[PDB]
Amino acid sequence: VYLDRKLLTLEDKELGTVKKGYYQMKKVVKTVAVKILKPALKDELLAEANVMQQLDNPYIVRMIGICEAESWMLVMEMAELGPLNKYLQQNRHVKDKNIIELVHQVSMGMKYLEESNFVHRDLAARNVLLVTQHYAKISDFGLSKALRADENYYKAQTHGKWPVKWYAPECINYYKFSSKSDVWSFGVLMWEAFSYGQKPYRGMKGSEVTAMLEKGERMGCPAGCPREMYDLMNLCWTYDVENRPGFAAVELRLRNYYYDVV
Numbered sequence: 001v002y003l004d005r006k007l008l009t010l011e012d013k014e015l016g017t018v019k020k021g022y023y024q025m026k027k028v029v030k031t032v033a034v035k036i037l038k039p040a041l042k043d044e045l046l047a048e049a050n051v052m053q054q055l056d057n058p059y060i061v062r063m064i065g066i067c068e069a070e071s072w073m074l075v076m077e078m079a080e081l082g083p084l085n086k087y088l089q090q091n092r093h094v095k096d097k098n099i100i101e102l103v104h105q106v107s108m109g110m111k112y113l114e115e116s117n118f119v120h121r122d123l124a125a126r127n128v129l130l131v132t133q134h135y136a137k138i139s140d141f142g143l144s145k146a147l148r149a150d151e152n153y154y155k156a157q158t159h160g161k162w163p164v165k166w167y168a169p170e171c172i173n174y175y176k177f178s179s180k181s182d183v184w185s186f187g188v189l190m191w192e193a194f195s196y197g198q199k200p201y202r203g204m205k206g207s208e209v210t211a212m213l214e215k216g217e218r219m220g221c222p223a224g225c226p227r228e229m230y231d232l233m234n235l236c237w238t239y240d241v242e243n244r245p246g247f248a249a250v251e252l253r254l255r256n257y258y259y260d261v262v
């Protein structure tokens with residue numbers, strides 16, 4: 001998986017650092033996006049590549065390799081439309097059925113990740129990348145973890161900077177992350193998508209979000225959002241781990257409703 005720096009051209013125009021680039025392959029160039037560094041963070045990038053290396057699914061961003069140069073670089077195939085949130089912000093015209101299509105795709109990718117016993121831990125509309133307006137992939141495995149064969153959750157020892165507004169109660173309270181907590185995260189993602197890329201819990205501190213959730217309160221239905229899709233968000237936001245559905249159940253719900261609506 002170790003790539004030749006000579007065969008990689010980087011634009012100095014920053015995407016997000018993530019940079020666009022071109023990599024001369026078997027016979028053709030391939031358009032790639034490149035995650036670039038700058039002891040502790042070296043191992044994290046290499047772990048993230050180690051995660052990606054092991055995944056093979058149409059709805060997951062595919063890694064080309066790693067590259068030691070000016071710094072450590074992670075080289076992935078480019079999804080050129082960028083993050084789903086920014087896209088929807090700039091494209092209010094997208095029909096509900098198109099958003100339904102896209103979130104279902106994310107759930108198949110997440111069902112695959114659940115079957116493979118990996119936890120994403122950063123599932124948000126910002127880490128959903130569009131290849132085309134009708135093709136989404138999950139990205140950014142920086143926080144992801146392979147689950148031990150004997151356990152269904154990963155336990156963090158003390159938090160870092162966490163995307164708290166996407167995190168399930170059990171993650172906040174007990175530092176426990178399972179595919180069910182990704183399911184809660186997916187709910188917030190669905191909210192973000194049907195709100196055309198708006199920020200969740202606008203203006204609130206994470207601590208205030210935790211307090212709100214503990215009171216049984218949830219975000220309201222987004223303008224125009226199919227009622228069944230809002231119902232699915234709420235099922236995803238089941239406070240109790242044991243009664244929140246897994247992705248197998250979420251995907252099936254999404255698949256059935258999608259096929260019903262087309």
Ligand SMILES: Cn1cc(-c2cc3cccnc3[nH]2)c2cc(C(=O)NC(C)(C)CO)ccc21
Pocket residue numbers: 015016018033034061076077078079080081082083126129139
């Ligand atoms: C047009 N476009 C394409 C991408 C993009 C990044 C990327 C990474 C891997 C594969 N495909 C990708 N496509 C992108 C990212 C961003 C972007 O803002 N990325 C952040 C800062 C959230 C990453 O932390 C903005 C625009 C983009």
